[PDB]
Design a binder for these strands. Structure first.
Ligand SMILES: C[C@H](CCC(=O)NCCC[N+](C)(C)C[C@H](O)CS(=O)(=O)O)[C@H]1CC[C@H]2[C@@H]3[C@H](O)C[C@@H]4C[C@H](O)CC[C@]4(C)[C@H]3C[C@H](O)[C@]12C
Ligand SMILES: C[C@H](CCC(=O)NCCC[N+](C)(C)C[C@H](O)CS(=O)(=O)O)[C@H]1CC[C@H]2[C@@H]3[C@H](O)C[C@@H]4C[C@H](O)CC[C@]4(C)[C@H]3C[C@H](O)[C@]12C
Ligand SMILES: C[C@H](CCC(=O)NCCC[N+](C)(C)C[C@H](O)CS(=O)(=O)O)[C@H]1CC[C@H]2[C@@H]3[C@H](O)C[C@@H]4C[C@H](O)CC[C@]4(C)[C@H]3C[C@H](O)[C@]12C
Ligand SMILES: Nc1ncnc2c1ncn2[C@@H]1O[C@H](COP(=O)(O)OP(=O)(O)O)[C@@H](O)[C@H]1O
Ligand SMILES: [Mg+2]
Ligand SMILES: [Zn+2]
Ligand SMILES: [Zn+2]
Lengths: 927, 186, 75, 185
RNA sequence: UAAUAGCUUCUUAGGAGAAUGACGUAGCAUGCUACG
RNA sequence: CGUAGCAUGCUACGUCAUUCUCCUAAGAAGCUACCCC
């Protein structure tokens, strides 16, 4: 009968139940298991068919979120789980079981009935937040609704899920905070209940209902009491991105950890929170067996800096934000008191102290003078307090007495070229080539409206058992090159007449500081940064250049004290990346002389069913997490295995994080604190961006390979690859270089890549991405959602199913297959509205004369030559327009020189710039 | 190079050759003097090449020593400028409250982010609209950073002084926002 | 072909206004910048001309800046 | 190149051409060959420096031209930009731009940015009765190719004056310039 | 008014290579004078 | 027939002048990627 069974499931507990499903039959539900056994492995959405489910209704016959799972299995498992439960009965964090044998048809089937679970479990929340798909997210909307995070109309908004268009979604996610945190606490109870009862078992995410209880004892072996061990390696690790997405540790800022009570008033002078970090770690992540040093200066290697830094990135969201930044100290120079920084307090790397503190100095050499002028200790200490309400970022001081509002003037108009263009039939109504790239102007509040975009950077706790394998795969990607510290005389500077940041720009360009410092005290500074931390002020400038849309473009000018040492540290690797051809990171490979065709042929590195793909990171340089930037700086500093020691590498990392990651930004006469994200003006910006891009691609591949079912995988080599990938991720702590090589070979075989710092072209296998054995666009959207805190809409990431058309867009240059000589080659052509926009609008009044600038239109015609092969005629006419304009320019130039003097130029070789052959030779593979 | 004796030898060889030609000298004498002229010319050309090389090297050395002198004359100038900047900011320090909080520290180290917050005597509040002005610093005294601040000046985005009576809800559109209000610690 | 003439005449007009030191008056410069950016980012010709009129009336408002009587006399 | 060195080389070349035309043998012909060759070497030496000078006097024509033209271009930027602006504004041939431009010539300039939204305020000075008669018909005010409803007319002393007083007989008694405050209709 | 990369044009300096010519020393062929 | 000397022609080494080519360094100007669509 279907009613006596329902009366038995209620048991002694007086509960009113409605049967989900029908007629004492199993209820089949699609859940989010974290499973690992002999055949299947991974964190994937399975379909469970062994649990009869009843829903409890309270008085007034309303349905509440409390279920009675009556999972049925064999008798041996029933008795084993009964004994394990009777060992763990007295624990508070164990769901109330009820073991009973019921006469189903002709035999006594033994059922175990868990009482007052929830509909979903912690794995469902973790999966729906880590594998987000805006088309199909019904286990996240239902979780948000049923726990009063939102009122079920919040989803009628156009973009509720977006982090950049709708920041209020964060306020929704934080409403799950105290529901996650209690769960963590329940684990620290349950682990103890195992430890004191001698039960060895694996704590999986799919066994904890969202209340916090634990209800699965199937795979628990009992040992002598008091000596058990709970394996929480794969429980806390998958939960880690949720502990900062939902801000599960906000209730630690309040006294007695109660959300109703007011905030804890920490001491303003308190900067050493080591004891508090250890207390938090020992309260929440108690059985996380790996050692945790709150200060990363005690870390064993570059894989323990990532682990402890990732932990501190969570534990630093409960501490006041005024206790971070530099740690100043009053020193004396020839009897006069300076206040200078003798360390730093990184949110990620903890407290770092300088080792060369010169108390009671006598003279200040140029190195010490440069150091004391660079750091913001004197600048912030001698400035007046600032309260800027235009931004949410912390504001330190105002150096001047008034705030400076900087504008961007409009660009000059080249009327001669525009009249010539409209004379040749351009710019008609309905023409396919139209002016779209203009010189936009900005008002006074632009410089501080753009810096406010750093509100998109949130403290993100990355999954640490997976990041420590993505690091290995990325380092395998970066194995071809070589690097190390170089002497001061080997440093090459491309352009010396550019500004040296703040405050050094008030006395000269970078040439002054590269000529005033001899090589001895230029190596002394670099050897100082290897044992000390130099905070640095970086200025924000507004760029004055042609653009498609009106939003301001700020660029960070970093001080010469930072660049002068970063070039020395990184330039060997930076010149080895920019001199290797045929690699994944295509930096330093020209698009001229048949270099684009070689790029596109090295992308197609013998993949089976090629489909091209490209993705765009929304707010790439402003929403990049601190952990991924530290990851990039550690992968880029792995080449220093012989030139410098471990402490030197750590202090170089601390200097990079103090001068790039979390710095003091001078934004219009005011020092603000940059929350994070890479600055676009340091030495290692494009290459660190490339490392981060490859990290995101490998993370998407790992997620796509794990989240596949495991029984649908027909290729028996890929199933074993998944089953070993899960082991090398969570069930393995040391590096397994054989499998790292195997997975890197798999990625090169099926996910061939081409990277320019965020411009990625992928030539993935279509069959595997269809089966899910390789990352697709939805996987990158999910990875960017749970790991970058941005939403990558599918309207800006493209996919090309035909290889005879090339990538749709790479480095803002479209690609087309054109016939040259007797063979077909790929030629890149720019946006044809960009060349006209550069011709018509110039950023200097002397660039409007025309006759003075014939070597300016030659370069534009060189960049716009491939348009001649384009099938559209209005595209092809842009090159002939520039050729005829160069001819007219030279004609009137010779006229003006024949007027100004009485003799023409004798040796004149401008007769080849209006010929198509000089530009056709620019895209020929000979040179 | 003309002062060298090689030029004199070349000139006297040419003069002897010309005198022999004008005097109707024999073939042997003419050819011998021509060969003497040749050996003088080769040595004079070598001397000229040596002089050109020496002069180009001396001029390059002068350029090198007139560039290093400028480098060492700018190094001292930027050093003096940096020392002046580091000492003016020192003379701007409030050595009463800063000294008190630093001596109050356990190890002497205090975070930089709280050096102004407890010692700065001047506060510059930048306000984008009237609602923020009403919320944070309405009136002539407001409380920020656990201290009482008194308004001393209000300027607009145009760096024009604005009287505190002009900042009203109806007069808000006629003001050039943002407003920078400068207050002093009390 | 008169749609793309407005997108350039507004550029020249904002250059003129910037050379007339309207950049110092922040309230007026914000309106001039917004009008210029809305003229450039305009697909419809009527909207571009309607905003061009408002951008030009900033130039005509200042009496002593330009000599409109002389400049238009060259026609 | 027809320089005196080339003249000597040319007469030597003509002598050697005559010798070749004879061209029997042998020692006098070799002597003519050596004399022609040394003359050619002297001419080439004294013409290479002339070519160098001709090349170096083309890096002082271009450098002077793209400096005089540069300073001329960046010196007349305040007036050339305005002339270009008004040339383009004549070229557009719009109805509203030409209307406000032709009104600004007579002195009928607006005191604020002309608003776009309906029922928005525009304060425009009208400095004479002649310009008032054309723009203002009844209570309607034609400006920027749009019709506006007049709210308040204030004379130069800021004293309000009703539209009944503004007439040809009583106009000289008023304190021009009037300021009309209209709302877009 | 930033980092890195690529490309175009011009100038200077240095090095290397090739060609032509002038000249100076070594080796080969031919003719003339003196001696054996 | 040999030796010494002179003269003429042909090869090898060195100096200088001219032309051309290539590279390495330095300097100056410009364009693009960058930023946004
Ligand atoms: C790595 C981890 C701890 C290492 C240790 O220190 N052991 C010490 C001795 C424990 N005892 C055997 C006594 C080992 C020790 C024994 C465990 C496994 C058992 O197969 C039973 C069970 C089989 C299922 O299919 C999958 C789950 C189980 C729980 C396994 C997972 C994991 O692998 C465990 C925790
Ligand atoms: C032997 C066993 C498996 C190998 C290891 C793995 C994780 C270890 C526990 C936690 O790390 C720290 C915790 C706090 C104190 O540090 C000492 C006691 C605790 C309970 C540890 C006991 C024991 O050592 C455990 C179970
Ligand atoms: C040699 C060359 C051409 C020789 C010629 O053919 N003359 C004959 C006259 C030409 N016709 C048609 C009037 C007859 C002459 C003609 C014009 C001369 C330049 C400018 O003036 C002045 C300028 C500034 C300084 O002064 C020195 C440099 C400059 C660049 C001069 C160099 C040189 O000296 C030029 C090119
Ligand atoms: N084919 C099967 N049929 C019924 N029960 C099974 C089967 N395979 C495994 N089980 C039992 O189910 C457990 C895994 O299911 P799980 O997802 O943990 O459910 P729950 O979380 O409700 O315990 C194992 O401990 C095992 O005893
Ligand atoms: Mg389970
Ligand atoms: Zn560590
Ligand atoms: Zn090193």
């Amino acid at each position: 009968d279907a009613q006596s069974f329902l009366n038995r499931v209620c048991g002694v507990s007086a509960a009113r139940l409605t049967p989900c499903g029908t007629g004492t039959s199993t209820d089949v539900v699609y859940r989010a298991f974290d499973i690992y056994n002999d055949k299947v492995a991974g964190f994937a959405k399975f379909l469970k068919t062994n649990c009869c489910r009843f829903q409890e209704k309270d008085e007034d016959d309303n349905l509440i979120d409390s279920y009675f799972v009556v999972k049925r299995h064999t008798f041996s498992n029933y008795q084993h789980e009964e004994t394990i439960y009777n060992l763990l009965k007295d624990c508070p964090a164990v769901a109330k079981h009820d073991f009973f044998k019921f006469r189903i048809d002709g035999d006594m089937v033994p059922h175990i009935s868990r009482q007052r679970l929830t509909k979903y479990t912690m794995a469902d929340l973790v999966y729906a937040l880590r594998h987000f798909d805006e088309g199909n997210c019904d286990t996240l909307k239902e979780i948000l609704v049923t726990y009063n995070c939102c009122d079920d109309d919040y989803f009628n908004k156009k973009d509720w899920y977006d982090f950049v268009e709708n920041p209020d979604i964060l306020r929704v996610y934080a409403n799950l905070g105290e529901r996650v945190r209690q769960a963590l606490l329940k684990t620290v109870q349950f682990c103890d209940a195992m430890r004191n009862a001698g039960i060895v078992g694996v704590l999986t995410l799919d066994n904890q209902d969202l209340n916090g209880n634990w209800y699965d004892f199937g795979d628990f072996i009992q040992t002598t009491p008091g000596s058990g061990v709970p394996v929480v390696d794969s429980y806390y690790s998958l939960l880690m991105p949720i502990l900062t997405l939902t801000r599960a540790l906000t209730a630690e800022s309040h006294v007695d950890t109660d959300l109703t009570k007011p905030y804890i008033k920490w001491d303003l002078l308190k900067y050493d929170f080591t004891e508090e970090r250890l207390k938090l770690f020992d309260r929440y992540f108690k059985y996380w067996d790996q050692t945790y040093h709150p200060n990363c200066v005690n870390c064993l290697d570059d894989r323990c800096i990532l682990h402890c830094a990732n932990f501190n990135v969570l534990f630093s969201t409960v501490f006041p934000p005024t206790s971070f930044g530099p740690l100043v100290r009053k020193i004396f120079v020839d009897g006069v008191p300076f206040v200078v920084s003798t360390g730093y307090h990184f949110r990620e790397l903890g407290v770092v102290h300088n080792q060369d503190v010169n108390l009671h100095s006598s003279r200040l050499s140029f190195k010490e003078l440069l150091v004391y002028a660079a750091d913001p200790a004197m600048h912030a200490a001698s400035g007046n307090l600032l309260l800027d309400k235009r931004t949410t970022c912390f504001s330190v001081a105002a150096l001047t007495n008034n705030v400076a509002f900087q504008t961007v003037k409009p660009g000059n108009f080249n009327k001669d070229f525009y009249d010539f263009a409209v004379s040749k039939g351009f710019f008609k109504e309905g023409s396919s080539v139209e002016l779209k790239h203009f010189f936009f102007a900005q008002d006074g509040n632009a410089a501080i409206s753009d810096y406010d975009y750093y509100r998109y950077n949130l403290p993100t706790m990355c999954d640490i058992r997976q990041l420590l394998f993505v690091v290995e795969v990325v380092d395998k990607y970066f194995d071809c090159y070589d690097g190390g510290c170089i002497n001061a005389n080997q440093v090459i500077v491309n352009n010396l007449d550019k500004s040296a940041g703040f405050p050094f720009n008030k006395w000269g360009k970078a040439r002054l500081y590269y000529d005033s410092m001899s090589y001895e005290d230029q190596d002394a500074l670099f050897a100082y940064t290897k044992r000390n931390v130099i905070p640095t002020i970086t200025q924000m400038n507004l760029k004055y250049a042609i653009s498609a849309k009106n939003r301001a473009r700020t660029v960070a000018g970093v001080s010469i004290c930072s660049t002068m040492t970063n070039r020395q540290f990184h330039q060997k690797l930076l010149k080895s990346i920019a001199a290797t051809r045929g690699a994944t990171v295509v930096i330093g490979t020209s698009k001229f002389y048949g270099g684009w065709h070689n790029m596109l042929k090295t992308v197609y590195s013998d993949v089976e069913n090629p489909h091209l793909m490209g993705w765009d990171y929304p707010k790439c340089d402003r929403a990049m997490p601190n952990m991924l930037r530290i990851m990039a700086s550690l992968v880029l500093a792995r080449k220093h295995t012989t030139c410098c020691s471990l402490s030197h590498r750590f202090y170089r990392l601390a200097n990079e994080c103090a001068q790039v990651l979390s710095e003091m930004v001078m934004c219009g006469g005011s020092l603000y604190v940059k929350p994070g994200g890479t600055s676009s003006g340091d030495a290692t910006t494009a290459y660190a961006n490339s490392v981060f891009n490859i990290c995101q691609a490998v993370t998407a591949n790992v997620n796509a390979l794990l989240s596949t079912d495991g029984n649908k995988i027909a290729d028996k080599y890929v199933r074993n690859l998944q089953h070993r990938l899960y082991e090398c991720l969570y069930r393995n702590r040391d590096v397994d270089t054989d499998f790292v090589n195997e997975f890197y070979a798999y990625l090169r075989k099926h996910f061939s890549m081409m990277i320019l710092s965020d411009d990625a072209v992928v030539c993935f296998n279509s069959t595997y991405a269809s089966q899910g054995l390789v990352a697709s666009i939805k996987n990158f959207k999910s990875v960017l959602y749970y790991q970058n805190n941005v939403f990558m809409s599918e309207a800006k990431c493209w996919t090309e199913t035909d290889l005879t058309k090339g990538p749709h867009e790479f480095c803002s240059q479209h690609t087309m297959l054109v016939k040259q000589g007797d063979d077909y080659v790929y030629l890149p052509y720019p946006d044809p509205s960009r060349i006209l926009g550069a011709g018509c609008f110039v950023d200097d009044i002397v660039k409007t004369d025309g006759t003075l600038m014939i070597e300016r239109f030659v370069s534009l015609a060189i960049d716009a030559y491939p348009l001649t092969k384009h099938p559209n005629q209005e595209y092809a006419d842009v090159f002939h327009l520039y050729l005829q304009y160069i001819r007219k320019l030279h004609d009137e130039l010779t006229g003006h020189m024949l007027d100004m003097y009485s003799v023409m130029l004798t040796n004149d070789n401008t007769s080849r710039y209006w010929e198509p052959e000089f530009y056709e030779a620019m895209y020929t593979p000979h040179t | 190079f003309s002062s060298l004796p090689s030029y004199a030898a070349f000139a006297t060889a040419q003069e002897a050759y010309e005198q022999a030609v004008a005097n109707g000298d024999s073939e042997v004498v003419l050819k011998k003097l021509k060969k003497s002229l040749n050996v003088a010319k080769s040595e004079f050309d070598r001397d000229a090449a040596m002089q050109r090389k020496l002069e180009k090297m001396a001029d390059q050395a002068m350029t090198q020593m007139y560039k290093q002198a400028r480098s060492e004359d700018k190094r001292a100038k930027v050093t003096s400028a940096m020392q002046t900047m580091l000492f003016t900011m020192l003379r701007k320090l409030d050595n009463d409250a800063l000294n008190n909080i630093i001596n109050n520290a356990r190890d002497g180290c205090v975070p930089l982010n709280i050096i102004p917050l407890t010692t700065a005597a001047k506060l510059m509040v930048v306000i984008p609209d009237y609602n923020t002005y009403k919320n944070t610093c309405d009136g002539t005294t407001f409380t920020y950073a656990s201290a009482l601040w008194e308004i001393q000046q209000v300027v607009d985005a145009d760096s024009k002084i604005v009287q505190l009576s002009e900042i009203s809800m109806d007069n808000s559109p006629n003001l050039a926002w943002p407003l920078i209000v400068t207050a002093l610690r009390a | 072909s008169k749609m793309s003439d407005v997108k350039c005449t507004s550029v020249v007009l904002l250059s003129v206004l910037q050379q007339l030191r309207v950049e110092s008056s922040s309230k007026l410069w914000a309106q001039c910048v917004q009008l210029h950016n809305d003229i450039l980012l305009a697909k419809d010709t009527t909207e571009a001309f309607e905003k061009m009129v408002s951008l030009l009336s900033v130039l005509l408002s200042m009496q002593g800046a330009v000599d409109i009587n002389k400049l238009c006399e060259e026609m």
